[PDB]
């Protein structure tokens, strides 16, 4: 049998993920991919840093999420430190935490529609995506990778503006999602390109430990978005999509309705924000203000020491996970009792979502296999967990 390794080929998509194919003439029936192109030494590296200093290495763990990562870290730290965050701060973590889902669910369709080979829905949506990075630069520090969420809540307040901008932005977005509905849904060939492909629906679709979509849209109703709270996140109203059967085209149609939920939540979140503060007030965790660290005596000693070493975290293990826009996000943060943490093991999606490519692939073509991968939305560097 021919043993071609169609992978390292820089054939668009993402020139990585080099695997083997022991194809039985035309059908595959055996797929054993290799990973480890970026191992980077991540989990060993954090063992020498402090809590505030290690924080951007959670940010660079995806390619896409900037505020959904570091959402799974501060909320994994504030439980250890007996802190609730202040109420103005929680309305921003839901706002940017429900704006990164309008970055994955744009990239999760176009990049899938580029491996397939369509050109024009790649350029028709990233030109609208530019209207959104101006937000990131205006609020935090940079284009994408922002050390913005801290353990002491939000870093700083978003400036004057950004409320007649987001309302200006979000009132003209549903026309753009009505474009791709005409581009892909009512079309037949793309429907014929993906129906009854990847029919994985049994209880081994959950014994493989999958997280969401490539879950509930295939069947079993469950999510971490209204059975487990984060912040002020249950006080808004929305629904969660479910597809019919257990193929890719009934996990594709989650993502059209999923983007039709984030517009509602943003248009529901803006009406409910109170004026208030930014940081936690007790200042053993938050740094004091700049106009304060130049006047009093108490401000500097709880400033100058708070950057030489970090916080004082109590011992005892902990664990949590939140909704990453492609899955769960496990962090088993072992604390020791000093400024420097102990072991920090992460669970990212793709461990389950790509080990189950063995079950999902066989009985099918070779041209099916590239169409499988862009449905799970697998990003490397994120499989470094």
């Amino acid at each position: 049998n021919l043993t071609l390794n169609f992978g390292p080929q820089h054939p668009a998509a993402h020139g990585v993920l080099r695997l083997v194919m022991e194809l039985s003439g035309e059908m595959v029936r055996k797929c054993d991919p290799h990973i480890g192109l970026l191992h980077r030494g991540t989990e060993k590296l954090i063992e020498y840093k402090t809590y505030l200093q290690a924080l951007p290495y959670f940010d660079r763990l995806d390619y896409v999420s900037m505020m959904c990562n570091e959402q799974a870290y501060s909320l994994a730290v504030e439980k250890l430190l007996n802190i609730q965050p202040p109420p103005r701060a929680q309305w921003i973590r839901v706002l940017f935490g429900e704006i990164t889902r309008l970055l994955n669910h744009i990239m999760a369709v176009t990049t899938h529609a580029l491996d397939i080979g369509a050109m024009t829905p790649f350029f028709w949506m990233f030109e609208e995506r530019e209207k959104m990075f101006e937000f990131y630069e205006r609020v935090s520090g940079a284009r994408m990778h922002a050390a913005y969420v801290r353990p002491g809540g939000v870093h700083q307040d978003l400036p004057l503006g950004l409320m007649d901008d987001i309302y200006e932005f979000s009132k003209n977005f549903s026309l753009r999602i009505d474009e791709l509905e005409e581009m892909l849904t009512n079309n037949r060939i793309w429907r014929n390109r993906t129906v009854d492909i990847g029919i994985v629906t049994a209880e081994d679709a959950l014994n493989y430990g999958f997280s969401g979509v490539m879950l509930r849209g295939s069947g079993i109703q469950w999510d971490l978005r209204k059975t487990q709270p984060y912040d002020v996140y249950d006080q808004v109203e929305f629904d969660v999509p479910i597809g019919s059967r257990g193929d890719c085209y009934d996990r594709y149609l989650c993502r059209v309705e999923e983007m039709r939920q984030s517009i509602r939540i943003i248009s529901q979140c803006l009406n409910k924000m109170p004026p208030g503060e930014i940081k936690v007030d007790d200042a053993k965790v938050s740094p004091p203000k700049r106009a304060e660290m130049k006047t009093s005596m108490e401000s500097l000693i709880h400033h100058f020491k708070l950057y030489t070493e970090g916080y004082q975290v109590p011992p005892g293990a902990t664990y949590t996970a939140i909704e990453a826009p492609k899955g769960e996000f496990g962090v088993y943060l072992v604390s020791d009792g000093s400024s420097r943490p102990y072991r920090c093991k992460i669970k990212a999606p793709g461990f389950a979502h790509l080990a189950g490519l063995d079950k999902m692939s066989k009985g099918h073509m070779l041209a099916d296999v590239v169409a499988i991968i862009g449905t799970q939305d697998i990003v490397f560097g994120e499989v470094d967990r």
Binding site: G36, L38, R40, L45, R60, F123, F126, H145
Partner: protein
């Protein structure tokens, strides 16, 4: 000679007028180059076409972070390029490997393997200084082919 040296103001102009780059998407510096492909700072048709097969390349681009499991595969593609080539690496993890720099399994530099000509700094260079690096590269081509065999 005024006759012969007039000719390389076409040929050394023609190679800096049509560059067909390869991109190695490995890490977060890949994503920002896609926004350069997105038609705000529209990368196409300013002299340079989009993606292309690995055979027909002139300017290879290493972006992101190199691991020791990719150090053989980089050199083999680097051999298959034709002769008037150039290497330009964006991203602060291609100039010393950013941080991750003291890790046990990251290539220190992306310079101890391939010879690279233009160094753009930064976690993501914002697709704003990177067209500036490319216009630096066409500015670097002031070389000559005549008055090389005409001298020696």
């Amino acid at each position: 000679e005024y006759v012969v040296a007039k000719l390389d103001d076409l040929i050394n102009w023609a190679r800096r007028s049509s560059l067909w780059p390869m991109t190695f998407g490995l890490a977060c510096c890949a994503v920002e180059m896609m926004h350069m492909a997105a038609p705000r700072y529209d990368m196409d048709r300013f002299g340079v076409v989009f993606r292309a097969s690995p055979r027909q390349s002139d300017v290879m681009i290493v972006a992101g972070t190199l691991t020791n499991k990719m150090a053989p595969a980089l050199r083999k593609v680097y051999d298959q390029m034709p002769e008037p080539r150039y290497v330009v690496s964006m991203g602060s993890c291609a100039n010393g490997g950013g941080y991750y720099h003291y890790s046990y399994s990251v290539v220190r530099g992306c310079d101890r393997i391939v010879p690279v000509d233009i160094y753009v700094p930064g976690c993501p260079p914002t697709a704003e200084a990177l067209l500036y690096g490319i216009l630096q590269l066409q500015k670097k081509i002031k070389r000559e082919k005549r008055l090389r065999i005409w001298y020696r």
